[PDB]
Amino acid sequence: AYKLVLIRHGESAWNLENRFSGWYDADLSPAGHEEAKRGGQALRDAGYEFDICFTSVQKRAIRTLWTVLDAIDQMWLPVVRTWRLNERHYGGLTGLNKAETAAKHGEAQVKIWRRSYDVPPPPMEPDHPFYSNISKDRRYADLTEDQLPSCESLKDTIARALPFWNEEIVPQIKEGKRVLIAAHGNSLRGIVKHLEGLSEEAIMELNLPTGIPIVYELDKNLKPIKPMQFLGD
Amino acid sequence: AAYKLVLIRHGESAWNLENRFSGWYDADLSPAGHEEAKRGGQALRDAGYEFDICFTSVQKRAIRTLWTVLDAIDQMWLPVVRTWRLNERHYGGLTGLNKAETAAKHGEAQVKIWRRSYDVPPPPMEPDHPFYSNISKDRRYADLTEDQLPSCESLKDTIARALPFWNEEIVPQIKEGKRVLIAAHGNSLRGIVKHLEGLSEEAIMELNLPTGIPIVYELDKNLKPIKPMQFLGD
Ligand SMILES: O=C1c2ccccc2C(=O)c2c1cc(S(=O)(=O)Nc1ccc(C(F)(F)F)cc1)c(O)c2O
Numbered sequence: 001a002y003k004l005v006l007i008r009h010g011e012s013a014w015n016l017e018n019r020f021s022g023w024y025d026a027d028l029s030p031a032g033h034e035e036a037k038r039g040g041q042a043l044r045d046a047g048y049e050f051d052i053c054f055t056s057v058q059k060r061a062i063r064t065l066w067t068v069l070d071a072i073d074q075m076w077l078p079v080v081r082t083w084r085l086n087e088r089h090y091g092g093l094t095g096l097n098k099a100e101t102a103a104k105h106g107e108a109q110v111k112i113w114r115r116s117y118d119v120p121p122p123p124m125e126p127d128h129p130f131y132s133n134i135s136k137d138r139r140y141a142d143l144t145e146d147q148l149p150s151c152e153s154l155k156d157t158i159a160r161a162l163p164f165w166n167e168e169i170v171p172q173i174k175e176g177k178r179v180l181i182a183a184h185g186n187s188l189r190g191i192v193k194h195l196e197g198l199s200e201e202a203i204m205e206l207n208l209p210t211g212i213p214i215v216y217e218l219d220k221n222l223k224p225i226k227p228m229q230f231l232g233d
Numbered sequence: 234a235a236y237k238l239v240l241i242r243h244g245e246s247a248w249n250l251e252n253r254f255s256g257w258y259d260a261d262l263s264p265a266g267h268e269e270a271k272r273g274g275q276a277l278r279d280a281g282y283e284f285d286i287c288f289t290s291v292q293k294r295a296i297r298t299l300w301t302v303l304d305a306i307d308q309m310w311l312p313v314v315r316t317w318r319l320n321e322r323h324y325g326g327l328t329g330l331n332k333a334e335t336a337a338k339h340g341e342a343q344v345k346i347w348r349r350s351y352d353v354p355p356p357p358m359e360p361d362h363p364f365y366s367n368i369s370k371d372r373r374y375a376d377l378t379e380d381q382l383p384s385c386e387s388l389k390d391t392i393a394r395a396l397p398f399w400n401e402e403i404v405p406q407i408k409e410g411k412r413v414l415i416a417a418h419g420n421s422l423r424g425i426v427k428h429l430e431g432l433s434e435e436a437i438m439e440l441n442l443p444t445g446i447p448i449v450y451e452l453d454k455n456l457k458p459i460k461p462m463q464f465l466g467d
């Protein structure tokens with residue numbers, strides 16, 4: 001059976017993972033970096049070998065990948081980065097903590113957003129402190145108008161992640177390349193939902209742990225032959 | 234000029250401190266070499282440099298140099314391409330030996346012949362060499378054909394396998410308008426510099442590229458330098 005490993009990055013600076021970090025390019029905190037080290041060491045202890053790596057264009061994921069590759073002595077592997085594996089774009093909520101979000105929008109609406117599969121947050125407007133920082137970042141300069149989000153529902157996030165999965169990652173897996181993916185909660189949710197055929201409600205209830213290698217064994221049709229497995233202790 | 238190319242040679246490795254021939258052995262940076270890379274990266278950051286694509290070898294002292302620079306200039310998101318063709322020169326049977334061991338075994342005379350030669354290789358790395366399986370059987374070279382995987386290299390050999398990557402993969406990116414950064418090794422970079430400047434064999438053998446410092450070329454549309462290489466920093 002094919003083997004696929006996913007890893008979700010850990011903690012980012014300034015408590016940004018509890019502040020809808022989204023497309024803001026927050027770095028790992030020292031603790032998130034250590035999480036990645038422990039994941040890498042788990043993969044090393046278990047003797048894992050990869051042939052190709054995929055990650056987003058966000059430095060907290062990239063640095064997670066770097067840390068893992070360092071730990072397993074496979075810094076020489078080919079690495080492919082794509083905005084399509086980015087975290088969900090949280091629009092105008094980006095950077096806000098829970099209290100600020102509730103104060104600005106009300107508990108009713110926040111409940112609706114938190115439980116909805118295809119309702120996006122409000123768009124990130126020009127007066128948002130991250131607006132030019134993100135929308136005019138030259139790493140997205142080749143994106144067309146529809147491609148560069150101002151906000152995303154979970155449905156949107158999964159919709160732009162899965163074409164990369166199908167077009168770039170799947171052919172590698174079917175060639176027998178051992179794939180490592182270092183990415184984010186919601187883009188990885190897209191992949192997991194596709195792999196396991198999960199419902200919208202199920203994927204919204206699924207919370208992937210951070211810094212832990214997530215192992216899939218896939219058959220010839222890229223269907224898991226058993227539940228996802230975690231490496232470490 | 235039309236194009237800008239930046240080269241960087243990695244700094245001190247753990248085996249440099251041991252005075253040992255590394256070649257294709259995958260020695261890591263020393264702390265000092267890592268700091269060198271940080272200073273180079275900061276020089277590129279201070280000068281506002283932007284890149285569109287990066288090339289490096291499959292050796293971690295170069296790769297980690299690249300990572301350090303990308304971190305410093307906040308461009309960790311750039312596409313990166315790794316290739317064995319940018320590896321350090323393969324030092325064959327000398328690999329793993331220090332200065333003393335090499336002179337003791339071969340004589341400073343024979344070492345004279347090797348280091349002053351453009352096209353005399355060191356002896357081959359044989360199956361009984363202590364690093365033979367560590368290097369020759371490393372799965373990162375699994376796709377090399379039999380003729381491609383060196384047992385040893387003269388500088389001529391090194392340049393001969395580096396320049397095809399330059400011509401076939403890097404040049405087209407430059408003419409596409411991509412701003413290229415190459416993080417690699419003394420001898421593979423020598424290959425590139427020799428091609429760019431049309432240098433003689435003796436000239437390239439007398440050229441010693443400084444480490445950890447961004448090397449800037451301004452190139453015309455035919456990739457001819459319009460002025461000498463420049464070093465970035467203070
Ligand atoms: O209010 C929202 C929300 C609002 C608008 C668009 C999208 C969402 C949204 O997607 C969301 C929300 C709240 C929770 S929650 O409380 O149940 N866990 C959570 C997750 C992340 C954050 C963070 F602020 F750090 F991003 C906060 C809370 C979610 O899980 C969640 O996905």
Ligand SMILES: [Cl-]
Nearest residue numbers: 066079300313
């Ligand atoms: Cl990389």
